[PDB]
Amino acid sequence: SMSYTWTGALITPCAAEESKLPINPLSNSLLRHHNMVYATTSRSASLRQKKVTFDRLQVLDDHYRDVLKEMKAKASTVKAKLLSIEEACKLTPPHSAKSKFGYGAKDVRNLSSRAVNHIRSVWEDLLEDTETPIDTTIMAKSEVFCVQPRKPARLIVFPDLGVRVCEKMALYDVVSTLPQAVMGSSYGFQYSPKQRVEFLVNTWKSKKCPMGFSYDTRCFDSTVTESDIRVEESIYQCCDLAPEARQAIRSLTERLYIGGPLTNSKGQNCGYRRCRASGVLTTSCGNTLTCYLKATAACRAAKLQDCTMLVNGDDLVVICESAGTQEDAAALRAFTEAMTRYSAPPGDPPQPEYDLELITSCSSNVSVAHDASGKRVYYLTRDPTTPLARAAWETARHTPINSWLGNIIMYAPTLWARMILMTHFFSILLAQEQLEKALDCQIYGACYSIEPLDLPQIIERLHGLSAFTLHSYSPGEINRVASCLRKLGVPPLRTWRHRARSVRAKLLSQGGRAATCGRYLFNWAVRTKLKLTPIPAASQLDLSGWFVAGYSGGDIYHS
Numbered sequence: 001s002m003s004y005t006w007t008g009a010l011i012t013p014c015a016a017e018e019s020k021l022p023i024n025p026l027s028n029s030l031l032r033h034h035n036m037v038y039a040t041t042s043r044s045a046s047l048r049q050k051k052v053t054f055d056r057l058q059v060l061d062d063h064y065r066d067v068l069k070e071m072k073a074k075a076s077t078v079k080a081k082l083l084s085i086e087e088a089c090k091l092t093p094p095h096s097a098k099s100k101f102g103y104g105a106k107d108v109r110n111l112s113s114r115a116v117n118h119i120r121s122v123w124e125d126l127l128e129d130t131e132t133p134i135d136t137t138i139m140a141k142s143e144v145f146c147v148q149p150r151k152p153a154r155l156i157v158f159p160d161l162g163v164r165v166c167e168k169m170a171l172y173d174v175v176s177t178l179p180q181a182v183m184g185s186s187y188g189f190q191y192s193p194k195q196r197v198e199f200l201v202n203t204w205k206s207k208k209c210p211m212g213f214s215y216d217t218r219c220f221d222s223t224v225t226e227s228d229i230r231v232e233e234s235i236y237q238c239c240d241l242a243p244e245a246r247q248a249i250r251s252l253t254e255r256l257y258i259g260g261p262l263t264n265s266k267g268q269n270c271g272y273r274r275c276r277a278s279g280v281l282t283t284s285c286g287n288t289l290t291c292y293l294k295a296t297a298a299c300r301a302a303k304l305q306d307c308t309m310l311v312n313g314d315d316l317v318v319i320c321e322s323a324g325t326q327e328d329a330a331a332l333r334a335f336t337e338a339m340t341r342y343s344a345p346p347g348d349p350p351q352p353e354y355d356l357e358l359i360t361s362c363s364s365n366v367s368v369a370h371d372a373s374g375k376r377v378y379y380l381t382r383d384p385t386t387p388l389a390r391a392a393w394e395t396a397r398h399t400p401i402n403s404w405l406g407n408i409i410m411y412a413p414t415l416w417a418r419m420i421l422m423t424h425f426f427s428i429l430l431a432q433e434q435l436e437k438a439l440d441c442q443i444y445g446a447c448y449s450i451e452p453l454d455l456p457q458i459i460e461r462l463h464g465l466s467a468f469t470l471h472s473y474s475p476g477e478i479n480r481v482a483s484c485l486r487k488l489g490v491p492p493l494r495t496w497r498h499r500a501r502s503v504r505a506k507l508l509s510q511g512g513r514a515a516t517c518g519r520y521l522f523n524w525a526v527r528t529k530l531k532l533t534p535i536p537a538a539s540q541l542d543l544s545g546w547f548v549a550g551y552s553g554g555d556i557y558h559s
């Protein structure tokens, strides 16, 4: 069927939309070619609609059914709990989109009577009505990028706040534990960056002759069929569930997940969706299961040998035993035709890779550097263009979510995160006296509130002390960074080193945690290297829930 149907009403913004990076003294200090940075707006929605609107072709075979059963066998071992209204409310980010029924995220978090009572009526409605398509809002997403040698806006679709809290009640526990139970080590979100690198590196070295490839599905959400979503529900249904949770899942599947009506911000009927909605709780888990199911079966169809996969939502990376250059290229092509029949045609043409550093997955790649001892150390990195562009935008404009903070956290060991992001934001924060103010950022889609001053302990725990001593990065990595800086008009190494020494001096003079940030985060900026010993606070850190599951588009806040 058609992924989308349109009435002709426009996808409208609900306020003024900024498209250009402001000329700001602070941001200009980070990136000078401000004209290369732009934010997508509803003005390009029409372009996106065209690309995501098409008929889906799907042919299921024995391999598909075989794998599905294997997956359900594992799902069968799970017992999901069903969250209380209060537990669900507490999972709503403070900046979550308000309800059209007289209450916002704040009322939900504070368990206001109007919010809880409306939430209860919505739940009761899910138990009683198994057919009525739930309404959803379609909006053009506002994201920042750097121009290329421009991307149209992504379209997000999400139900009312009341429904969102109900989703949490019925499926939060499911989407948090089912993926790992069914997919085991193949489930990417259970890994921290370091553990992802470890898994990838060990898998790679475990092959006699490794061959790997990332597989990019063209607009994955739109390729998801009604069949796919019901297959997804069938897996969820193998879980031991509370009666009400079971009905809620059945109802949400038919009324929301398989599709439904689209309404713009002006309240006008916009069209109909028959594919994955980007803004529901099951999107990450659902996409991961779907991608995993299709790929695993595609692998069997292509006769790839000793396949080891890593799936993060619609992101897939496979590492196998090579059968030789020619055979590999043919097998990859067969794999692709298999995925195509399953309704997951390729966007960028997949290509086999024989150098692990050249494989980009989850927008990142593995690279190696050296610690102070001179020992090789693997770590996760990525082209810094987008991170830097967004860092600039966030410097000039206040944003609910600070991607720079998440990038410092997730890419702490990288040359660019340390040289530029750390230096830039700490100098600004120290100057504005806000080192103590907690800020929100996202990790695998979930929102977290973090204190910049705790960064040293966080980095030590997630990446190890070596994150503060890496040097001698790869020529490929160094060149990518340097070319990025020239492209965006970002100051050179020497400028950042000078700025870094300057902030480090100040951080040290403040004592306490600031001093710790100065010693560990910027030891790279000085010749007189301080001794970096284990930070006591890094022992009493509970960072386990950070890497349990993916929640992008799931409106999740972890506290």
Ligand SMILES: Cc1ccc(S(=O)(=O)Nc2ccc(Oc3ccc(C(=O)O)cc3)cc2C(=O)O)cc1
Pocket (backbone or CB within 6 Å): 414, 415, 418, 419, 470, 471, 472, 473, 474, 478, 481, 482, 485, 491, 492, 493, 494, 524
């Ligand atoms: C966190 C960090 C760690 C070590 C150093 S270093 O000064 O000890 N060595 C390097 C300094 C710059 C660099 O990569 C660049 C970056 C920018 C430019 C440039 O501005 O053109 C040139 C080389 C790579 C390395 C290395 O150890 O491999 C600087 C920053």
Ligand SMILES: [Mg+2]
Pocket (backbone or CB within 6 Å): 216, 217, 218, 219, 220, 314, 347
């Ligand atoms: Mg894709």
